Amino acid sequence: GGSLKKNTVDDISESLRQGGGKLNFDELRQDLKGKGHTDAEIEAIFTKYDQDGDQELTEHEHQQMRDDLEKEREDLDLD
């Protein structure tokens, strides 16, 4: 709709919680692939958030996800 979908975060959030708030590209991706998530979609989300390019997504990176989602889909609309 805008930039990110709350539905996506739910998928990544759940898988992240299972790994202990921390997971690597390979582990999260496998957990994502088993849910029906495409590599392209995962790579975009992972690249988008993995600003450190450490090929790893942590609770910190995921935190921005929820924040970035609310600044767009929350507190505003038509502007």
Ligand SMILES: [Ca+2]
């Ligand atoms: Ca990272």
